[PDB]
Amino acid sequence: ETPREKLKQHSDACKAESGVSEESLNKVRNREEVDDPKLKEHAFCILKRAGFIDASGEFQLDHIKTKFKENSEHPEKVDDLVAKCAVKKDTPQHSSADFFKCVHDNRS
Template sequence: MKVVIVFFALVAGISAATLPESEKTLLKQIHDSCQASPSTHVDENLLRHMTQHSQNPKVKAHMLCMAQGAGMMSHSGVLKMSVIKSKMAMTMHDEHLIDTTINKCVIQKEDPMETSMDMWMCFMQNNIGYMHAL
């Protein structure tokens, strides 16, 4: 199966450390769990081309599920900054860059789906190395 980066990074842009295998496994389990639920299941081709489908309600629901499953957002939709920072630190080692990216990408909005989707899209645009491959 062709490996495609789903979110958080574009292969060409990754210059940071590789995500630990344990975290890759966790992300795969979270993805599979989100795919198993009818409310968060989405065609994986839409995920493979997420930038073109960022306004798709199914993509948004799936990415919200991923954020909540990874512990980056509570089930009530509140971002967990310390968790997000620790996830980013797995592949980024520049504290200032992590803080700058958090200030740019991790913005609480009224709608949890919008909050989550905007965060993932910003992470992709800024080549954040926290990723899941299909």
């Protein structure tokens, strides 16, 4: 009866296991490269909510490239980088981590 707060939680179900705190994610900021399940898993949890990838795992670069393109400091290399970063892997949840890592580990 009237939630008021309206707890959404981007990873309400992903928290059951993929509850990667601000530890390994922060490491992504630096060129250290850290392998972790909750990390890659948590990412997909945001991708599905962000409105990029579908419940089936179909990558949508047309929407990703446009996002990084429109309003940016140097929008032009993202589109090409999207192809190399959005490489279709054996699973959809995998490619997710590539989005929040590849673009972050891009040489200037």
